[PDB]
Amino acid sequence: LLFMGYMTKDNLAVITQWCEGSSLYKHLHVQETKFQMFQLIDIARQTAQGMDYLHAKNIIHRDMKSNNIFLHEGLTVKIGDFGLASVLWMAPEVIRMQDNNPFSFQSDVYSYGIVLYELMTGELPYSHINNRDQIIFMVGRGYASPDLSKLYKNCPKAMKRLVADCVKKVKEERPLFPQILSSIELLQHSLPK
Amino acid sequence: EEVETFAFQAEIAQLMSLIINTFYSNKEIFLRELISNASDALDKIRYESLTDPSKLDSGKELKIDIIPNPQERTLTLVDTGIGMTKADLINNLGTIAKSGTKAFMEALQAGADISMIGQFGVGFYSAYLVAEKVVVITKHNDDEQYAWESSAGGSFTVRADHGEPIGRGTKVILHLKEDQTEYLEERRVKEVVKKHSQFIGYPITLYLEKEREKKKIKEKYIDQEELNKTKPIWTRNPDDITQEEYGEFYKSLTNDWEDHLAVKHFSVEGQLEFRALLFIPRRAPFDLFENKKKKNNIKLYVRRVFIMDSCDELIPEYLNFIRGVVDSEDLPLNISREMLQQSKILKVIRKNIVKKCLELFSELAEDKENYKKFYEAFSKNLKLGIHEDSTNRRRLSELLRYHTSQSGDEMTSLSEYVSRMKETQKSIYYITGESKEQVANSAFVERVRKRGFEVVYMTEPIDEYCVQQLKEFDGKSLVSVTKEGLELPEDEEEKKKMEESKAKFENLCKLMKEILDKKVEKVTISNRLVSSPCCIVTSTYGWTANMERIMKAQALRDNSTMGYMMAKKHLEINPDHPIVETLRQKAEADKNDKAVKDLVVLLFETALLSSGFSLEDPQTHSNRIYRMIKLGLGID
Amino acid sequence: EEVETFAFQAEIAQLMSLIINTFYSNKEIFLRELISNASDALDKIRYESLTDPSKLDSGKELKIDIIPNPQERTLTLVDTGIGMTKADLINNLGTIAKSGTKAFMEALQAGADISMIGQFGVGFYSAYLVAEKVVVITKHNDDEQYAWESSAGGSFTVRADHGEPIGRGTKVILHLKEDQTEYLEERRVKEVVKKHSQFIGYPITLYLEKEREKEISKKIKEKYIDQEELNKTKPIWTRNPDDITQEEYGEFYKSLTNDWEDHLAVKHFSVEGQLEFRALLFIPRRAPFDLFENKKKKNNIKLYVRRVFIMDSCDELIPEYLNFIRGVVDSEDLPLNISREMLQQSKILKVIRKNIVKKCLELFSELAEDKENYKKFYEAFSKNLKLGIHEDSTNRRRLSELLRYHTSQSGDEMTSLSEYVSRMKETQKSIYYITGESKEQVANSAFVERVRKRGFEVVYMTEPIDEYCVQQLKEFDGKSLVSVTKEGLELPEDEEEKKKMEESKAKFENLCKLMKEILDKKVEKVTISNRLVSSPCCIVTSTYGWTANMERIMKAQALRDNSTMGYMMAKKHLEINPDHPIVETLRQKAEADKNDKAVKDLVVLLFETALLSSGFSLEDPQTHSNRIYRMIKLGLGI
Amino acid sequence: VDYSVWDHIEVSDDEDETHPNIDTASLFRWRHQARVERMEQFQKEKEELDRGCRECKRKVAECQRKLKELEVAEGGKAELERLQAEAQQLRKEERSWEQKLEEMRKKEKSMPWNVDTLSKDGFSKSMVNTKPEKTEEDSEEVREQKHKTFVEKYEKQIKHFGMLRRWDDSQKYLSDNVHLVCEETANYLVIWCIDLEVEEKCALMEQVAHQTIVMQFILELAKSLKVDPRACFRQFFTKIKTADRQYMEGFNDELEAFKERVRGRAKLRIEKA
Numbered sequence A: 001l002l003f004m005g006y007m008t009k010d011n012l013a014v015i016t017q018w019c020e021g022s023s024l025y026k027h028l029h030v031q032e033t034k035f036q037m038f039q040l041i042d043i044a045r046q047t048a049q050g051m052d053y054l055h056a057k058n059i060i061h062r063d064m065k066s067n068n069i070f071l072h073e074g075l076t077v078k079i080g081d082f083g084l085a086s087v088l089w090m091a092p093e094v095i096r097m098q099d100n101n102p103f104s105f106q107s108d109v110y111s112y113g114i115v116l117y118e119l120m121t122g123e124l125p126y127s128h129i130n131n132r133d134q135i136i137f138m139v140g141r142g143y144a145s146p147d148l149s150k151l152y153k154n155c156p157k158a159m160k161r162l163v164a165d166c167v168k169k170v171k172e173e174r175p176l177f178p179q180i181l182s183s184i185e186l187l188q189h190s191l192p193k
Numbered sequence B: 001e002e003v004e005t006f007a008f009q010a011e012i013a014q015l016m017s018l019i020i021n022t023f024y025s026n027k028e029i030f031l032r033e034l035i036s037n038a039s040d041a042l043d044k045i046r047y048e049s050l051t052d053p054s055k056l057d058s059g060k061e062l063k064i065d066i067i068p069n070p071q072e073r074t075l076t077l078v079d080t081g082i083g084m085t086k087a088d089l090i091n092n093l094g095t096i097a098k099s100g101t102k103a104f105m106e107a108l109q110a111g112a113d114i115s116m117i118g119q120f121g122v123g124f125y126s127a128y129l130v131a132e133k134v135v136v137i138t139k140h141n142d143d144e145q146y147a148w149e150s151s152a153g154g155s156f157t158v159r160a161d162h163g164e165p166i167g168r169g170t171k172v173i174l175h176l177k178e179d180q181t182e183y184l185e186e187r188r189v190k191e192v193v194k195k196h197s198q199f200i201g202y203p204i205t206l207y208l209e210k211e212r213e214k215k216k217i218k219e220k221y222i223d224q225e226e227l228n229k230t231k232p233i234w235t236r237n238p239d240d241i242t243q244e245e246y247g248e249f250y251k252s253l254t255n256d257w258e259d260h261l262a263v264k265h266f267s268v269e270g271q272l273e274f275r276a277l278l279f280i281p282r283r284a285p286f287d288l289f290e291n292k293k294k295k296n297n298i299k300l301y302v303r304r305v306f307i308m309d310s311c312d313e314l315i316p317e318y319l320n321f322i323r324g325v326v327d328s329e330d331l332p333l334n335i336s337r338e339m340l341q342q343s344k345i346l347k348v349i350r351k352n353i354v355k356k357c358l359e360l361f362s363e364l365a366e367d368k369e370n371y372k373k374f375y376e377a378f379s380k381n382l383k384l385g386i387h388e389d390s391t392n393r394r395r396l397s398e399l400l401r402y403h404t405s406q407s408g409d410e411m412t413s414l415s416e417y418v419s420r421m422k423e424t425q426k427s428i429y430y431i432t433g434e435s436k437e438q439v440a441n442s443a444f445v446e447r448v449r450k451r452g453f454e455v456v457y458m459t460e461p462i463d464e465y466c467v468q469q470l471k472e473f474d475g476k477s478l479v480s481v482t483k484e485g486l487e488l489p490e491d492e493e494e495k496k497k498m499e500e501s502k503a504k505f506e507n508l509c510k511l512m513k514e515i516l517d518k519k520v521e522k523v524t525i526s527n528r529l530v531s532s533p534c535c536i537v538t539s540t541y542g543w544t545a546n547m548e549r550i551m552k553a554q555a556l557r558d559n560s561t562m563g564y565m566m567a568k569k570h571l572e573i574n575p576d577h578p579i580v581e582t583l584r585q586k587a588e589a590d591k592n593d594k595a596v597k598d599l600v601v602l603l604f605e606t607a608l609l610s611s612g613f614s615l616e617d618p619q620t621h622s623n624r625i626y627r628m629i630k631l632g633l634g635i636d
Numbered sequence C: 001e002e003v004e005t006f007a008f009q010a011e012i013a014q015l016m017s018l019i020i021n022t023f024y025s026n027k028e029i030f031l032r033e034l035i036s037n038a039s040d041a042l043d044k045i046r047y048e049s050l051t052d053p054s055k056l057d058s059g060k061e062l063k064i065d066i067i068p069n070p071q072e073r074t075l076t077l078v079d080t081g082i083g084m085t086k087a088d089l090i091n092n093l094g095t096i097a098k099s100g101t102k103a104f105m106e107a108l109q110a111g112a113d114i115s116m117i118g119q120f121g122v123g124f125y126s127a128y129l130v131a132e133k134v135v136v137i138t139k140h141n142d143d144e145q146y147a148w149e150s151s152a153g154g155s156f157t158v159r160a161d162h163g164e165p166i167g168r169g170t171k172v173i174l175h176l177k178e179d180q181t182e183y184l185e186e187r188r189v190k191e192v193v194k195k196h197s198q199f200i201g202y203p204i205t206l207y208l209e210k211e212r213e214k215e216i217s218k219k220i221k222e223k224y225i226d227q228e229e230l231n232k233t234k235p236i237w238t239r240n241p242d243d244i245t246q247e248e249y250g251e252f253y254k255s256l257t258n259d260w261e262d263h264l265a266v267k268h269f270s271v272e273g274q275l276e277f278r279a280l281l282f283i284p285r286r287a288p289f290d291l292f293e294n295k296k297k298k299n300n301i302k303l304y305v306r307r308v309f310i311m312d313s314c315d316e317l318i319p320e321y322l323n324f325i326r327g328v329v330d331s332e333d334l335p336l337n338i339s340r341e342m343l344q345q346s347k348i349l350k351v352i353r354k355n356i357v358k359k360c361l362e363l364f365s366e367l368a369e370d371k372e373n374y375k376k377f378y379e380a381f382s383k384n385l386k387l388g389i390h391e392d393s394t395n396r397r398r399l400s401e402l403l404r405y406h407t408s409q410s411g412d413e414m415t416s417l418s419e420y421v422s423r424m425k426e427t428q429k430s431i432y433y434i435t436g437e438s439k440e441q442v443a444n445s446a447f448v449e450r451v452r453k454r455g456f457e458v459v460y461m462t463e464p465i466d467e468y469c470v471q472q473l474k475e476f477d478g479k480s481l482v483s484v485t486k487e488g489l490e491l492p493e494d495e496e497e498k499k500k501m502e503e504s505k506a507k508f509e510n511l512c513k514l515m516k517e518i519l520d521k522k523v524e525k526v527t528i529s530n531r532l533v534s535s536p537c538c539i540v541t542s543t544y545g546w547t548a549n550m551e552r553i554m555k556a557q558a559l560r561d562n563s564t565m566g567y568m569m570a571k572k573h574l575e576i577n578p579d580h581p582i583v584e585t586l587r588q589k590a591e592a593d594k595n596d597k598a599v600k601d602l603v604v605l606l607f608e609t610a611l612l613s614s615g616f617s618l619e620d621p622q623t624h625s626n627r628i629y630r631m632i633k634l635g636l637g638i
Numbered sequence D: 001v002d003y004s005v006w007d008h009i010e011v012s013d014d015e016d017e018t019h020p021n022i023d024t025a026s027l028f029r030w031r032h033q034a035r036v037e038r039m040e041q042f043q044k045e046k047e048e049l050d051r052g053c054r055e056c057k058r059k060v061a062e063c064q065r066k067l068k069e070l071e072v073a074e075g076g077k078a079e080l081e082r083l084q085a086e087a088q089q090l091r092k093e094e095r096s097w098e099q100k101l102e103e104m105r106k107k108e109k110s111m112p113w114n115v116d117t118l119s120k121d122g123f124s125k126s127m128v129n130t131k132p133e134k135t136e137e138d139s140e141e142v143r144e145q146k147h148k149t150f151v152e153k154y155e156k157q158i159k160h161f162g163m164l165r166r167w168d169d170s171q172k173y174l175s176d177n178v179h180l181v182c183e184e185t186a187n188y189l190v191i192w193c194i195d196l197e198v199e200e201k202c203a204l205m206e207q208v209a210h211q212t213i214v215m216q217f218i219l220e221l222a223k224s225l226k227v228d229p230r231a232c233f234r235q236f237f238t239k240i241k242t243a244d245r246q247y248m249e250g251f252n253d254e255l256e257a258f259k260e261r262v263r264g265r266a267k268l269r270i271e272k273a
């Protein structure tokens, strides 16, 4: 008799170990997932890493937005611009279109400061005008002074000065990103204080 | 201030030790180097015969002979090329890093019709990796026969070769040392020649005494020429090659006889110039995705000499099935000629290889039977490419063929789905499951198929990862039918009836939420069932039932986060089913009846069955079904 | 005869072109080579100071500095080493393939207490990978300072250097090309030093004018900052593995792997012989989120030769199942390529692999004694241990003793197979186990009821890797692993149970064959044995093939062949319990009338519920749902 | 010898330069969108310089012609000097134009390569193979002819393989002797071991029969996994090296059954003769 064979062992091997499976997006400021300042300092540090890496490769973005960020399962943030997922997140130079090419790193640092503000306060910047006509007025006039009064209590003061300097309307005095790495380092070192 | 100009010197003994010892990590490349030198000699003597055939009047043939000899422990490689005079025998074979091949090539620059394999000048001394002492017996057409000899000690001797005369060429005699006698074995020589120099344009012949005569005395020598039997077919123009010749080359490439499915013969010209020839195997290899097989599908050739095989930088992991040859002329090579100096040249090559492979697949998608066979073989690779290769996702997705409701037992393309799709419909309705029949007759697809909408089945586990990244096709998004809130074109009557139903079915829904507060995170009424009472769809964020099954079955997964991205079960009930009508009638009378909660939990468990989930433990469900069958047949 | 001896020569221009173009695949290793030369010089001067400290009067500190100068497009590399005289400057730096370091090492002569990272003599010329002109300004103790200068044009000049004086050592000025200017930035310099020469025995301090000067009572950004950060950490593995404390090991581990917490266990060993090396192996406290993501490649183990990076771990240095192990392997005598980015003898890595694997397994064995820490190790790397059981075959016996499992007499704590074998009865000759999907899914399951009734232990394996582990693990001490989900399960019985089972089989054979006809192609054959207590039916698998969970695992693998999906699957052997009321009350309904619609439906429903309980998915679950709904409607009154 | 044209390559979707805090699928599109913009800007720059050079060449030609005309005509000496000054200014502009041309030539030299400019597509040809599928099982026609050719040419190979017993030696030989594994060779091996059992050579009996059963097992495995037996023979030895004791039991049971069957055939042949 030729039996049945009991051969097996064809492809019962541990084949390629695949990846993927994430937690969620960044549009969670309306979900109200606000936590203690540790998980906010870490997010700011990782996103500053990403922005500084982008600046090193001389890549101009100008389009940093709460929609343009993604959080991953390992508590790592992948800041990749996920297409659509606009208003109030731009820069006066971008809005004016005087040169027809407003692509400059100062726009990146202004957008980063706006992102830091909306991350640390948990509320949209300039959260007092919801009119399409009115919002463009501030950037068109070239003088836009935001307010920082909804800050969460018991937080390090480095972020306050950082967001104050980042959103300033002088293109030759905004803080560069090498400043931001030192700022976030002293920020995480000032957590226990 | 004074300037004392000097000139760079070299320490010859240490330089020779560097070339012998710290220069070639693979000891078997010496044969490749010697055969490349022989090929260069033959190319020289064949190029000189172009102007006048008198240069060839010492033997017509241009051949390479490999002559192992284990009695004296020597390996002789004989060519009939150009040879070299005493002056050349000194200048080229005595001066390290000086190449007569380079000088010969740089001399012409006006009738360039040869591609000569050599520019560095150190390749010959690689013969000292395996040989303790080499003797080079050459004979040019302009000089007498000479006998170069050196033990790599710092000196070489040149004699007049008072012995056996050779007509022309060179005869490198490697007195192999004690350790490296393995290169006299026929199998080892055949393996090395086939691996490294098997597309050399001159017959490479192995000589050994193993053939018997009529049936003893093996004195006769086996003139085994079949070391270089397969000629490089990618050199000829694509118009000049017939299907049969491509098939023969493909069979010779794979060490197994079977025809190929399709062929791609292309070339790019510019700063980076190469000829490629890519083959789609007729059937997928039985170990195609076994990671233990490394990767050797695509082989890189520089001037018809093997350099490196596939790496992740030459061909993506999802195109590891398609095998071929990439031959280039000008590539910046390492000193050992087994890797490129610039490694991103490999990536620029890959950028063309992948584009041409996708063009080959697209052109293969014009005869339905051939592509049906190709898809049955490599649909997994296509979907892996959709998941992994993002820059080609749009083009790769048009190569997807899926079973669907309106096609039957033939797979149909998503573009054809969009063509047949109704104007009112504005999404791609797909169901991911475990088999063809399991999803064909399922709770979620009942209403969609009843209204005539086409549904794309996705049976294989690879489809979960395929649709992780395929979130949109042709501008119309892919929405699962197992996810909650399935948006469907609602007529006025249907939506009015739905509003009335949720205005009528709220009490038992609150009862469901109360009895099932941890298992189920929402109970509602939706119009996706026609003939089933309840199905558990998953919330729009998280893992579906099938995706959760697949990811839970993975052998190597971080089990800590399995509950991090787990499904959110949303049990839903079908208002028109008689079971839910009776249940509502029984729940209106009282909310704490034993029968009500029994039937509700059993409905939830049987919908967990139907929806593709798995229970916490099916023993409880089996025990309750056994108690019910005992009640039915009456044994207490 | 007419013999005539010549001498081997070289074409210098071509040889220099070979060094510059066809030796090193990465241009950034010029900095590694220059720092290696600086380290060799410092070793020279220190060793010479050991005998006569009178030659250390021309400077005391032994320090390497890198001074990028973006204004003039230069990258100086000063060093307070030994310097070179005019003769040494002409010979060592002018003659290709001649090494003064090798000459010095060969002059140590029984008293050699130092190691050097220079032997070939071509390393210096890697500076022309990035620098179009190299100006070396050296100063020996017993010779004035000379300014060597070349452009790799086949000539060089050696002037008197009437410029600014230095006490000792060499100042290798590189004039970088117009396009190799990325090596002036702090990012690339720090990256290169960290990657290649971060364990050089002397402080490598980098200079840049980026300091923000203090201003109070403007925005000044022009001040040099001496950043010795390039070489803060020391090569701890050069010390004895006994005089080091756990805090030093933890600090080194945190610095090496950038972990925010220290290591879990450390194995520090070195082997002496023909192949010698010091190895420092760490077990990370928490496994990475992508430990098995092979597309991330592998750099866990790092190979150093004389404290200089050679190559990060490949497939041949550490097994894939030990890829969690972070550490370094440092050897003094390893033959290297000309690029020094690989070993000449790749067969050496196999001996190193054997030693590393043996010592890692010894580390695991010595860690297991402290159960408090072994639980922390196991709950993180049990998958790796089981993958080693599956793949590695020579260390399977040693690796099996590190397996901890849930049994039926343990509770919430895992126990090893040795504790099993300790608690087995005298008449038991096997280790019972079950492969399921969860702990509770198998704790109360059909196949385990009788076994726990007799008070046997059952190992609960609720992980997908466990089926792979146990299809290879076939014994332990002599007690074979026998699944309770497979057919032919034998328990220690006596004459009484044997005759009772024989009577039950003889009574129920008609029911079994009738059920087989009802379930013709859906069950291979219907059995009766002692596996169930309070359940009427459970389907077991043929004695060799795929269990229910194994088939469930292999049907859900993304990259699996879709052609062998029927040739290995289970041969479902349904079993009935001849003591349960349900099956015997339908034995009467069977012997009263073989063909009965009620009996048909009951048998099909019972087989389907056994299918669900055992683990096999239904062929089409909507059929089972529909028959459940019909039965609910019938028993409910609608 | 000189690799200075391959040291500046900017591949966009370069997988080995990725930041784990940036989306690789979105990192590879930022690089592309900047690369194409650099190309467009440089193209417009060199195009506008080309048209400016053409315009200045036309202007200087016209100015030279007008200078010649004014020199021919008497009375315009002051106009001649004014046009000479204008032509000097035009020539200064003309010679300054090539300064920017050399500047952009140098910039092109310093501009890195990429997949778009490194190579230009040559002559590509895709052509699909259409060959008959499936094989036929027959006891006559080509199968018998192939059997006779195989036994006539490869008798020595069959004998040498049958003389071997070692699993590793068998695997190495069959790796060098892949032709020996096919159904026709299986039939020849069966009839050959039957003939040997007629000749009653026990050592050669078992030596041939064990390898015959090994090849039959390999063929059964190949029929099971739907790949040709001529290539998968290598995996059966590795399988039996780590196979269960039950695999050895089944193999030895098949050995015993084959022994009994061939012994019965040989006894029947002897009795008939």
Ligand SMILES: Nc1ncnc2c1ncn2[C@@H]1O[C@H](COP(=O)(O)OP(=O)(O)OP(=O)(O)O)[C@@H](O)[C@H]1O
Pocket: B033, B037, B038, B040, B041, B079, B081, B082, B083, B084, B092, B093, B098, B099, B100, B101, B102, B117, B118, B119, B120, B121, B122, B123, B124, B125, B169, B170, B171
């Ligand atoms: N069989 C041969 N016939 C003629 N000349 C030969 C032969 N073998 C070697 N030579 C001579 O030896 C010289 C140097 O040999 P070697 O192989 O080291 O250099 P190469 O061919 O330029 O190779 P590589 O650049 O790969 O190191 C060649 O220029 C050639 O003139």
Ligand SMILES: Nc1ncnc2c1ncn2[C@@H]1O[C@H](COP(=O)(O)OP(=O)(O)OP(=O)(O)O)[C@@H](O)[C@H]1O
Pocket: C033, C036, C037, C038, C040, C041, C079, C081, C082, C083, C084, C092, C093, C098, C099, C100, C101, C102, C117, C118, C119, C120, C121, C122, C123, C124, C125, C169, C170, C172
């Ligand atoms: N900074 C330095 N101080 C002292 N001697 C130096 C210095 N740089 C180079 N040298 C001398 O120059 C010689 C040649 O330089 P090179 O770096 O090429 O050689 P090597 O270090 O011995 O070789 P390799 O590193 O390639 O094995 C060295 O052997 C050493 O004697």
Ligand SMILES: [Mg+2]
Pocket: B033, B036, B037, B117, B118, B123
């Ligand atoms: Mg050569």
Ligand SMILES: [Mg+2]
Pocket: C033, C034, C036, C037, C117, C118, C123, C124
């Ligand atoms: Mg050095």
